[PDB]
Amino acid sequence: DEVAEKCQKLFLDFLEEFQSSDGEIKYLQLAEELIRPERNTLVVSFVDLEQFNQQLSTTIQEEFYRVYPYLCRALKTFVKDRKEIPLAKDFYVAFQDLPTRHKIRELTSSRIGLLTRISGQVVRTHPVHPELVSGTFLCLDCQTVIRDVEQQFKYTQPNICRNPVCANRRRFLLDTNKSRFVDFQKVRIQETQAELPRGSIPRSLEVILRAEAVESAQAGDKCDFTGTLIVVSYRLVFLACCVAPTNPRFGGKELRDEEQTAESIKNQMTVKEWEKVFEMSQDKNLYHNLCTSLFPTIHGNDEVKRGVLLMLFGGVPKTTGEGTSLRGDINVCIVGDPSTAKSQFLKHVEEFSPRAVYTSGKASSAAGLTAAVVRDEESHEFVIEAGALMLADNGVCCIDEFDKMDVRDQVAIHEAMEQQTISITKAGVKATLNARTSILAAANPISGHYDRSKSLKQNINLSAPIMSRFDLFFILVDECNEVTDYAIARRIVDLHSRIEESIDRVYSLDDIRRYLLFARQFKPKISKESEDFIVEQYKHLRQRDGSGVTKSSWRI
Amino acid sequence: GVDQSPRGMKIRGNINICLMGDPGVAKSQLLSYIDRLAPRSQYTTGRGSSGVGLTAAVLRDSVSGELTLEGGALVLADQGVCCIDEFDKMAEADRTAIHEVMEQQTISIAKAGILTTLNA
Amino acid sequence: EQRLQRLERLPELARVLRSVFVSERKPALSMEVACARMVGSCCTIMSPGEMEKHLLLLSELLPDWLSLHRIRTDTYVKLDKAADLAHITARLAHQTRAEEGL
Amino acid sequence: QKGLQVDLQSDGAAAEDIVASEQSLGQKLVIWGTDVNVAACKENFQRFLQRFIDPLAKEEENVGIDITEPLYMQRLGEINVIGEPFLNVNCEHIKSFDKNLYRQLISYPQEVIPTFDMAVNEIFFDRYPDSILEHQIQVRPFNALKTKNMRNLNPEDIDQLITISGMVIRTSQLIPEMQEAFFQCQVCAHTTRVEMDRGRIAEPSVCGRCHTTHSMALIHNRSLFSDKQMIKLQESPEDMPAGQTPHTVILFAHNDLVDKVQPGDRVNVTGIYRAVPIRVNPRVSNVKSVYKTHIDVIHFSEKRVELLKELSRKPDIYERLASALAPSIYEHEDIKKGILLQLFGGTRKDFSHTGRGKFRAEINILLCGDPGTSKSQLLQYVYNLVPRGQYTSGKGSSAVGLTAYVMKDPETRQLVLQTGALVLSDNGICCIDEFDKMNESTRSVLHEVMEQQTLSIAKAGIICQLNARTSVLAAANPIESQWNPKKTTIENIQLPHTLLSRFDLIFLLLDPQDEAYDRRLAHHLVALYYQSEEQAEEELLDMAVLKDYIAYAHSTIMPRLSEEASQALIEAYVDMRKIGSSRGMVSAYPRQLESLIRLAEAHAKVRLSNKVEAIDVEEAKRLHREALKQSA
């Protein structure tokens, strides 16, 4: 058709007319790498193509499956003018940088041929498998070799041979050294728990990438694949191209993976995120004003508001001398409430921080949240399935009611608060991963309330090896005075009578999430006047631990 | 007694009687006579078969694709005499279903799926 | 002060809102269904409570680029997607300079 | 279906005499197989779009459409602006215009509905011929005047418009159905649209310019597909018979109708009851003797509200309605007094701006006594009257089987979820007995259903968090089914402290040994034992008013707290804390404070008043005061 040919001649001039930063084109440096036959990078920016033409780029994303062979012959002709290339290796369009994102639940029947982008995250990982693209068959009737055999989505066989007398209406023969294959991966994606406000219908979608899109594809990648949905009996498969592991949903573009200077980050961030974190960081009550502005329904108890804010940040995963990362995250848990008022502490964090889960005691068995293993039904092979602790990486997992549970589940999670890693080798299948997820436990008393007659170790079910690996341990303060119920009752009246009017925060929730990425930028150091202050405070808690003679209650 | 169901609700009915005795004091004479006396009364005892085949027998019918639940002594003895010996020997699950089929005589079946009420 | 950050997104949302109405293939739409359709399409990490604010402080300044009205259910939003961005950017830049010059 | 038209004239003869005038030789053309002619049905529908005036149309619902002017004449400028070319036409408007056209649409909607799609296009081109959309304007008739069931499906209603309302349990995935075929030649470039109507597969062997057999390969990546969503639906619980399980009919949805009806709602399904022979082998054309019954989905009065408002001003409505739930027991009115306020609950409020979105205002009543003495009528009477009631067994059902569990399913190749009983009765009332001897594993899963209102089940690699909430009642029983004065009420109840604290009120069936107690109880059941039905409908109101009294205040009157009536909740909370004597210094949790607010919202809802005064606040603490003296 003449419509597809018009979209290729004008696209060839885009790589020479539209400049980049200076008077050079970003595709000029990419042409020097394509000469070496092991790397085929063809990144095309969509936000820059609309500046030169808009009506031309409309038919590209609307009908992409038909212009698929036209993009391979146009880019190969343009690079031929730069430098002569051999005629024995093809390429692949790597169209990325799409500002428009589509939801998995937003799909109909005409989604094929649309060059869009799908979000989500991948859980299951499959090995590479080749694919017959450019092959060569041989007729077993007249002994003639037929070259240039392209396989689309079915078994494309030559119905008419070279001899116009008879043909082979059965099978052929796969060539050996005259057949080019392209390997791919048949990964299994999964809907993210931070984008499902209503309805709980989990499903997946077939995603197939290209040859150079391997390596960076392991169990625990929250990337968003980009490509075009292809329809197969009759199934669905999303043909991807490149990957880009970023933050869940939207968010920033830098956390604990890429490090740069301070002059290159200012050119990418907005101007509204500069003076907001500049004049407010010089105050003296910055650590206290962020406690009331986030929990307006909680009156009093300043010991639980200053620990939840530090839970998101905390320590950093350092590296020892031999190259082994130890700890680097704070853990806390409360006890002294029969699930009557501590439930709101886990709900405010689940809605705020998207990297958080929520489960009860009986809802989590032995595995499920760590790493589940089960033989596949359509492959018959022992695979490894990620849990809830692997999806909430660099975050915090919530868990309530620590009583209605057995003992086999606590043993399988002992390597989470001390090593922050998962090492499960079951059935000769190695699956050693890592996750920096803090455990936000919530212990519950035996008889519901704290008994004053019994000891402090007889009201809880936690033993010594469990509390030794755990970090901070708080207990809810219980006061039986006439002023406690008189002050908490006034906050309940103002909340149920004045709907959406009792909140009097000084900083909205839009700026709280912005200050989460600035903490992971400039890593603080240790002053030379603090080594003498830490060695003199540990000896105080050493004598505070041994109240009797040697041991007592909490071991420090 | 009276079986009219007035004021929306349903009053009680059907005479009830219990008897304690060692199975061997000519109890078969008091059971075989009443079995042939009533027109709708089958000879069912506490033993001789399994306890899940006389009050809760499930039949997996794969020819139609349904799930039914029958008994053997309280599903076919409508307006008759229910003959059963050794009232205190079965499990607790067999004695729980008697709480509703004895007062107002309404069979209540609710095992996640089967939602019906048999009249017997 | 609640719309200062919204004025900074005017040169940014001009390119995002232009592509989300072309890839969807649907010509006209409404704002009631927009609370669950384009709420996750536009790259905005801000809370959805202020999503219905940029649809009023932008169309009233340029009635020709976007014309719509209000009713009660399924509105009639018609966006002129057949215009080149070489001249649309110059139209929205007239009111932008007036905000920073107060 | 594309059927041809056969003329009904004398075969072999052109015209037997009859000059000039047309006698018995007019427009006798009609479709072979249907008494509906395209040349006659189109003319009868064009006047329906121009000469139809509905003065009884409202203004709050038909905004933008004039009432005095024809309604369909103003809809010409509405289809080209909404985007989708689908006009919504109600079947009730057709009967009020022409009675002949109304009977032909329901009797055979296979050729009358496609006929209406061509009549609207002719009128639309005569008003706005420049405004174009995707394909063409289609008519989706809905809201019929028939209400039948799956058992009353007569054999004469085949291929007719049948509207049966029900409840959708769960839905299937997405099954693409290839409609028009698409092919591409291996030599030249030529497209061919092969209509695969009536489920037929055929491909042309002759190309455009090549003219070579076996040279046109098939490509199924550029054609138009359609999702086949298998939707199941059974008989509605409001009109289902008692004594048998309802029948489930399979529903189909294509085009834009896919993913429109969410599972778990009550939407009136308007479709065509068709029947297709089941194909056993897709290769050889085989016909099964048993067909598949499928239905292709297409899409209060003022004489009773005024009577409910007059009873709200009467100060005796709260006492008459409380005594209607006691058809046998004369006394013991305080036990069933709190059950009447359970159906109302209160208006649910939202506080997502402060980090606390979900919030339940339902009341959970706790009972205790002998299961059979006075609790035999309070467990089966709130099931037949209330349509939103689901009865289930405690020991007869499993712990995970009652809610939403995970079960294998090799048919869909996906671990799908299954429903239960309490997960379907949302915004209603659940029925469940045996709480004293229930399973140990069942008591643990109830710590977040009626407490957190979010069933979070993350096990076996299944991440699913259900948001089902329903007020659940319980009926406990002591260790000896009798109150023991030698021991306190704490030791009698075997439930832990964390379980009994989640309930609001608490009662206990007491049987005093007083001689004068039988003079007011035994003399009442005997008086109504010999009397038949000559006094039930004379001294007691009917049950038709109670069902209509709660279906009006749950979506019209939203009460809220004020500044004066809310100050009494603080003083009453401090007095009920330093109880002592029985247990000690307890009740220091926001549980009883939250349940006390729910009692005030339920009392003001029965009075039909959004403003809560200090009168209803004094009545909320009175019910809680009687619960303390009952268990002590």
Author numbering:
A (entry chain 6): 20 to 251, 293 to 616
B (entry chain 7): 361 to 480
C (entry chain G): 445 to 546
D (entry chain 4): 122 to 420, 441 to 773
Text from the published report:
Human DNA licensing initiates replication fork assembly and DNA replication. Helicase loading is a multi-step process that hORC-hCDC6 initiates. By blocking ATP-hydrolysis, it is possible to assemble a hOCCM intermediate, which incorporates all human DNA licensing factors except hORC6. The structure highlights how hORC1 activates the hCDC6 ATPase and uncovered an unexpected role for hCDC6 ATPase in complex disassembly.
The final 3D reconstruction from 8730 particles resulted in a structure with an average overall resolution of 6.09 Å. In the hOCCM complex, hORC1-5-hCDC6 adopt a ring-shaped organisation with DNA located in the centre, the complex is organised by an upper C-terminal tier made up from the AAA+/AAA+-like domains and an N-terminal, lower tier made up of the WHDs (left). Consistently, we observe that 38 bp of dsDNA running through the core of the hOCCM has a length similar to the 39 bp observed in the yOCCM structure. Large sections of the structured N-terminal and C-terminal domains of hCDT1 (aa182-317 and aa413-546) can be seen in the structure, with the N-terminal section of hCDT1 binding to the hMCM2/hMCM6 interface and the C-terminal section to hMCM6/hMCM4, its position within the hOCCM seemingly similar to yCdt1. Interestingly, more substantial changes can be observed outside of the hORC1-hORC4-hORC5 motor module. Specifically, hORC2 and hORC3 are rotated by 12.8°, which generates a gap between hORC1 and hORC2, that accommodates hCDC6.Fig. 6 hORC-hCDC6 in the hOCCM structure. Inspection of the interface of hORC1 and hCDC6 revealed that a loop in hORC1, which has been unstructured in the context of the hORC1-5-DNA structure, became structured within the hOCCM and formed a short helix. This hORC1 helix contains the conserved arginine finger, which we observed to be proximal to the Walker B motif of hCDC6. Thus, the hOCCM structure suggests that hORC1 and hCDC6 form upon complex formation an active ATPase pair. Crucially, the AAA+ domain of hCDC6 stabilises the hORC2-WHD in the hOCCM, thus revealing its active conformation (left). Importantly, when comparing the hORC1-5-DNA structure with the hOCCM, it is clear that the hCDC6-induced 12.8° rotation of hORC3 enables the hORC3-hMCM2 contact, as this pushes hORC3 further out and generates proximity to the hMCM2-WHD.
